[PDB]
Every structure is written in C-alpha cells, then in structure tokens.
Design an enzyme around this catalytic site. Structure first.
Site, PDB file in Angstrom:
ATOM      1  N   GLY C  69       0.745  -1.357  -0.082  1.00 30.55           N
ATOM      2  CA  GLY C  69      -0.050   0.133   0.007  1.00 30.55           C
ATOM      3  C   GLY C  69       0.632   1.229   0.083  1.00 30.55           C
ATOM      4  O   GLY C  69       0.271   2.586   0.218  1.00 30.55           O
ATOM      5  N   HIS C  70       2.332   1.067  -0.084  1.00 33.39           N
ATOM      6  CA  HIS C  70       3.044   2.290  -0.135  1.00 33.39           C
ATOM      7  C   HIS C  70       3.363   2.759  -1.604  1.00 33.39           C
ATOM      8  O   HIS C  70       3.987   2.126  -2.297  1.00 33.39           O
ATOM      9  CB  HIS C  70       4.472   1.980   0.571  1.00 33.39           C
ATOM     10  CG  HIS C  70       4.257   1.542   2.135  1.00 33.39           C
ATOM     11  ND1 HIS C  70       3.927   2.274   3.050  1.00 33.39           N
ATOM     12  CD2 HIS C  70       4.646   0.573   2.510  1.00 33.39           C
ATOM     13  CE1 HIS C  70       3.817   1.583   4.090  1.00 33.39           C
ATOM     14  NE2 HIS C  70       4.327   0.360   3.807  1.00 33.39           N
ATOM     15  N   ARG C  71       2.771   4.016  -1.872  1.00 32.26           N
ATOM     16  CA  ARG C  71       3.360   4.654  -3.229  1.00 32.26           C
ATOM     17  C   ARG C  71       4.475   5.449  -3.133  1.00 32.26           C
ATOM     18  O   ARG C  71       4.124   6.506  -2.538  1.00 32.26           O
ATOM     19  CB  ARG C  71       1.994   5.256  -3.775  1.00 32.26           C
ATOM     20  CG  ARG C  71       0.802   4.193  -4.354  1.00 32.26           C
ATOM     21  CD  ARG C  71       1.324   3.587  -5.585  1.00 32.26           C
ATOM     22  NE  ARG C  71       1.393   4.533  -6.647  1.00 32.26           N
ATOM     23  CZ  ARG C  71       0.434   4.582  -7.681  1.00 32.26           C
ATOM     24  NH1 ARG C  71      -0.602   3.830  -7.702  1.00 32.26           N
ATOM     25  NH2 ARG C  71       0.676   5.308  -8.575  1.00 32.26           N
TER      26      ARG C  71
END
Ligand SMILES: [Cl-]
Lengths: 202, 197, 199
Positions: C69-71
């Site tokens: 979920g880390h952009r």
C-alpha cells in the site's frame, strides 16, 4: 497486515522511545512487537541516546534500531572486550569505554523496509525510504531512497523543488481533519497542487 | 545490556562448541549456532577464543554444505531422504572444517559466519556482515560478502600483540596493567609484558 | 537437521502457497513464518509458487503483498487508505500487485535470504545465504549479496539446455531411483543420454 499494522505509540513503554502520530509497525504479531526492534536501549536512564521517530512512519517487520552506541567496545584500545562492565574485582581499575553516538532520529513520513538495521546515531530525513535489509550506517537525506549493506544512495522520491515545497508545508503538522480535506492530493503525485492548496489556507 | 551478559561458557551444552573464558553473548547463545549436531564427534566444531564479544542474533553456520552438491545434477540431498527409491543416492555432505574465532574478537549483531571460516585474533566483524572467507588478525570487515575495511593497528603493533598474547595472562595480571589495556598504548603494554618475563 | 528438514507441502495451510513434492524447510516456528504478509483469505493477491525438490534454508523470507500500500510516487508513503480513520475516507488505494513469486524446481535458497515480491527464480538456481533477491534469477544461476548479483552458472549453456529438455523433476521417484548414480554426479551429458533411451 503490512497495510495497517498497529500504531507504535500504543506498543512502547520505554521513555527513551519517542514516536509521532499514526506511525505503525507491521511485525506486530511477532515476539513482543515493536519493542523487539529496539536493541540495547536502557529504559531507566536519561543520559543515553534516545530513539526519535516522526509521525506517519511505516516500519517493516523485523527492523532493528541499534542503540547503546559502541556498547563499551573501543576499537582503538588494546582490546574491544568491555573490562569496565565485568563484575570482576580484578578489573576494578578499568576505564569506561562507552561512547555515546547521539540520538537516532527518524523523520516524518519515513518507510523503513523489513529487517533493515539502523546503526547508532543515524538521522534519517523526512520522506526517506529505507529498502528492506538495508544497513544504514550514515545519515539519510530527506526524500532519499537507499539500500544495501552499507546502505547507499539509490534515488530521490521527488525533484528538488518538490522537496522544498514539502519542507515548507510540513503536511504531517496538519490535523487529520485537514489532511482529510486534501486526501485526493495526498494520494497523488501532485506535489505542486498540494503546495498551492496549503498556501491558500495560510 | 550489551556491555556484559551471560558468559558463553556457562550457557552451552553442545560438546562441539568450545569457547574460551569471559567470552559473552548479548542476546541464548545456542540459538546462534545453526545445524551443529551435539551427538557426533566427526563434524565441524565451533571454536571461540577467550575475551570475545558476540552481538545479538549473530549466526554461525555449521554442517558444511548441508548435503547440497552444487556440482551435481541437483542440489537436493537425495541421500538424506528415508525414501526407499533413493537408496543408491551418494552422500553429498562435504565438511567445511572447524569454524575458528580468535581471541578478542568483536562479532557485530546479526553477522553470519559461514562454515569453515577462521577469524583472527582481535578482528571486528561489522553488524550484519556475511563472513564468507577468513579474516586476518586485527582486521575490520563488513558488508555481504564481508570485505576489508581497515586494520585496528599497524603491522608492528600487531606483531607485538601476537608475541605477548595478553589473553593468556591471568585475570590478576590483566588487572595489574588495566590502565594500559584500556588505552591505545600497545608499545607500553609490550614493554610492560617484557618486564614481567 | 539441515539435510532433510521437513517437507513444506505438509506444514502449510495458506491456499496462496503452492509447493511441489519433496521441497523442504530446514528451520522447522515453521515454513509459514518464512512467508511475509500473504493474505490466506483472498484469491486476488500475489501467490507464492515453489517447485519440487527445493531446499529452503532456515529463516528465509518471501516478501508478499507487493508494495504493501506504499506509493513512493505519492506525496506520502503512509497508506491512508488502510487506516480506519473517518477523516481519511476519501483516501485512494495505494496497493500495487507485484505478480506471483515463482521459485523453480531444484532451487537451493540459502539461510536467511530474502526474496522480494514478484521475483521469478529459475530451475536449478542457488541463492546464497543472506542474499536479497530484487530481480529475476536465471535457470542454474548462482547469485548472492544485497541486492543479489550474478556469481556464476552451475553448468555450461549446453548442459542447461539438456536439463531444460529432460525436466527430471517430472519423473517419478521410482524413475529417479533408476538413475540415482547419475543424479549424484556431474555427468549431465550421461543423464541426458539415459533419459533419451528411456523414451
Ligand atoms: Cl546484507
């Protein structure tokens, strides 16, 4: 599980660990949780290096923050064996080889990859990304991406002007409600849009 | 707690682990040693000199190649299955030799020592180093695989230390020269040793 | 117990892990502790696929769940979408799939290596202990370090082409028994001729 974890501030009781809002640890179900990440940190002294972690950080499972400096080992003395810390009467004349390294300081909005190791005294700037299994032996700049052992420069997340904009606006300082009003910008690459939005609130 | 802790000698039961006096682990130590059979006297041993400091989560890889032959068709150790179909498999196990850690060695946290490695007296292994080959006396190494960083002392100071072998002195004698032991004055300790002979 | 460990097929319950016969783990906390962030209740996530006759060393790590979920390209890497906070309701989902992690047949994974998401490791490969595998590994390639990099190939290109033809891991245990002297040898050319005669 890695998307949410559990917030660090609830997990810690060591006064020498200071952690900002919403920062979380994804190794929550292993061992004692975030506490296992923090190595050799004395909870009952106020004259030791502390661990400072900014808000909105994501810490991957099994990350290690090395505290206690040189652990009493002086590479420059005849021996690295910490005579001073042996309960031995013969060793009563020993000199203290402990050397403090300074606080470990992790900025806001830092993503620490799984099983990375952060060495004593390191400062990691806001927005940085530490690759999984990186061994960080030197300071990391804001919005810098590093990896390997010892960790080395990979890239920066944004342009220098975008970094300056982020350093001015300090979005982690805003309330959750204010972050909620601009969530569409937060979840985007539009650094310029968010800077313009912030200025119009000032 | 990394400044001292439980001395290794008192917390090992494996006869294939031999460790000198005062060497300690700041983590117990048995969990550091991987794949070491405690019931066989025909396997690689782990030998640790005196006055060593071992950081939390260090790993000493034993059991050699674990039966895996990179030069054979497969690395799968068919020989070590109880499977009747593999009864004619050939034993792929290759001993590496003893792991030998010298006196006065500082092994950083979560370093991994590969099988058969010798680490000389006074060496320092950086945390998370992966030591794949021998390390020289008083050499500092790090990274994965571990590479040379520096020597702690000059060649002539190293020779002085290899002659005097302070770790062989009694704790009582070490107490008598403790101001020198807690200094960079290697020549002073050397001259002190000669005066005691 | 590094030599036979315990077989992986029997010590797993996560349906997103698929493992071939005889593959074993020598840190038996068991093999499931090696697999990081893998959701066992969904069918739209990256899977972990492991060939037959693999040897996985103690403490190996298989990183699943993609970017978690880390952009990196968004303002923040903090996964606002996965926080139950009412203020963050308009958050966009930053999760990106990496694709399946695919470990081939006859692969030796060294102790405490970490396999990053989406990586494919070819048949016959060897991953050194503590390697951090950030990209695909070729058939019969030996890699190590962090990030992992090429060390050598176990066999010549002609021998590798022979092994990719014969796919001995597809044979029965009974057939492998009949050529065990060749299996426990460097005689790739000999095994290829034996296989040709069996067809
Ligand atoms: Cl590494």
């Amino acid at each position: 599980s890695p998307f949410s974890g559990k917030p660090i501030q609830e997990q810690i009781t060591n006064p020498n660990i200071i952690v900002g809002r919403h920062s979380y640890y994804s190794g929550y179900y292993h061992g004692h949780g975030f506490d296992d990440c923090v190595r050799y940190l004395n909870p009952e002294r106020n004259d030791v290096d502390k661990l400072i972690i900014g808000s909105f950080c994501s810490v991957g499972s099994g990350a290690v923050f090395m505290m206690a400096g040189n652990q009493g080992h002086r590479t420059d003395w005849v021996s690295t064996f910490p005579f001073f810390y042996q309960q031995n009467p013969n060793f009563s004349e020993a000199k203290d080889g402990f050397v403090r390294a300074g606080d470990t300081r992790i900025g806001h909005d830092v993503w620490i990859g799984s099983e990375a190791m952060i060495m004593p005294g390191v400062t990691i700037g806001d927005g940085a990304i530490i690759a999984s299994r990186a061994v960080v032996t030197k300071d990391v700049a804001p919005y810098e991406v590093v990896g390997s052992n010892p960790a080395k420069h990979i890239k920066f997340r944004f342009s220098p002007q975008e970094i300056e904009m982020l350093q001015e606006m300090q979005w982690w300082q805003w309330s959750d409600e204010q972050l909620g009003q601009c969530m569409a910008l937060m979840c985007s690459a539009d650094i310029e849009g968010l800077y313009l939005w912030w200025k119009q609130s000032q």
